[PDB]
Amino acid sequence: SWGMMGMLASQ
Amino acid sequence: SWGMMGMLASQ
Amino acid sequence: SWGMMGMLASQ
Amino acid sequence: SWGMMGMLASQ
Amino acid sequence: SWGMMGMLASQ
Amino acid sequence: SWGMMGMLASQ
Amino acid sequence: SWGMMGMLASQ
Amino acid sequence: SWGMMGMLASQ
Amino acid sequence: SWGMMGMLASQ
Amino acid sequence: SWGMMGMLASQ
Amino acid sequence: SWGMMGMLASQ
Amino acid sequence: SWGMMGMLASQ
Amino acid sequence: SWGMMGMLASQ
Amino acid sequence: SWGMMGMLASQ
Amino acid sequence: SWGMMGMLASQ
Amino acid sequence: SWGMMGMLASQ
Amino acid sequence: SWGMMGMLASQ
Amino acid sequence: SWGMMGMLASQ
Amino acid sequence: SWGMMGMLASQ
Amino acid sequence: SWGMMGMLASQ
């Protein structure tokens, strides 16, 4: 089993 | 301004 | 079994 | 302005 | 079994 | 202005 | 079994 | 302005 | 402005 | 079994 | 401005 | 089994 | 300004 | 400005 | 089993 | 089993 | 200004 | 300004 | 088993 | 088993 999380934020 | 997030889960 | 979630927001 | 989200589940 | 949900909003 | 949503379920 | 969903929005 | 959506399910 | 999303599930 | 999700947004 | 994301899962 | 996730954001 | 984070777990 | 991230998992 | 975490922040 | 993670950010 | 950190664990 | 990081794990 | 940690900070 | 980590930062 495997999981991934990705987040990108910019102003 | 910008923002994006993503998640993936697999069992 | 598997699931995905994606979100994108911008001003 | 813009925003979109998506979800997918598979058992 | 599987389900999907998609939403898009804009001003 | 604009907005659209969709759902699909399959058992 | 299989399903597809496609959405396109533009201003 | 424009918008179109589509869904297809096959068991 | 523009936005499009797509999902495909196959069991 | 397999699934895919793709999203594109632009202002 | 621009943004795109993608996910693929295969069991 | 295998999964992939890709995200690209730009202003 | 900018910021991005990512996590991956595999058992 | 620019930013991109990617993840790949294979069991 | 293995996990990874990556973070990038900038002003 | 194997996994990879790559991130690139620039202003 | 800039800052990035990373961690990897493998059992 | 620029920054990139990468990780690879193989069991 | 093995682990790694890397940190970089700059003003 | 083996792992690698690489980081590059510049102003």
Curated annotation (Swiss-Prot), chains A, B, C, D, E, F, G, H, I, J, K, L, M, N, O, P, Q, R, S, T:
Cellular localisation: Nucleus; Cytoplasm; Cytoplasm, Stress granule; Mitochondrion
Listed name of the protein: TAR DNA-binding protein 43
Domain notes: Consists of an N-terminal domain (NTD) and two tandem RNA recognition motifs, RRM1 and RRM2, followed by a C-terminal glycine-rich region.
Lineage of origin: Eukaryota, Metazoa, Chordata, Craniata, Vertebrata
Natural source organism: Homo sapiens
Task of the protein: RNA-binding protein that is involved in various steps of RNA biogenesis and processing. Preferentially binds, via its two RNA recognition motifs RRM1 and RRM2, to GU-repeats on RNA molecules predominantly localized within long introns and in the 3'UTR of mRNAs. In turn, regulates the splicing of many non-coding and protein-coding RNAs including proteins involved in neuronal survival, as well as mRNAs that encode proteins relevant for neurodegenerative diseases. Plays a role in maintaining mitochondrial homeostasis by regulating the processing of mitochondrial transcripts.
Subunit: Homodimer. Homooligomer (via its N-terminal domain). Interacts with BRDT. Binds specifically to pyrimidine-rich motifs of TAR DNA and to single stranded TG repeated sequences. Binds to RNA, specifically to UG repeated sequences with a minimum of six contiguous repeats. Interacts with ATXN2; the interaction is RNA-dependent. Interacts with MATR3. Interacts with UBQLN2. Interacts with HNRNPA2B1. Interacts with ZNF106. Interacts with CNOT7/CAF1. Interacts with CRY2.
Post-translational modification: Hyperphosphorylated in hippocampus, neocortex, and spinal cord from individuals affected with ALS and FTLDU. Phosphorylated upon cellular stress.
Disease: Amyotrophic lateral sclerosis 10: A neurodegenerative disorder affecting upper motor neurons in the brain and lower motor neurons in the brain stem and spinal cord, resulting in fatal paralysis. Sensory abnormalities are absent. The pathologic hallmarks of the disease include pallor of the corticospinal tract due to loss of motor neurons, presence of ubiquitin-positive inclusions within surviving motor neurons, and deposition of pathologic aggregates. The etiology of amyotrophic lateral sclerosis is likely to be multifactorial, involving both genetic and environmental factors.
Location of this fragment in the whole protein: 333 to 343 of 414
Tissues expressing the protein: Ubiquitously expressed. In particular, expression is high in pancreas, placenta, lung, genital tract and spleen.
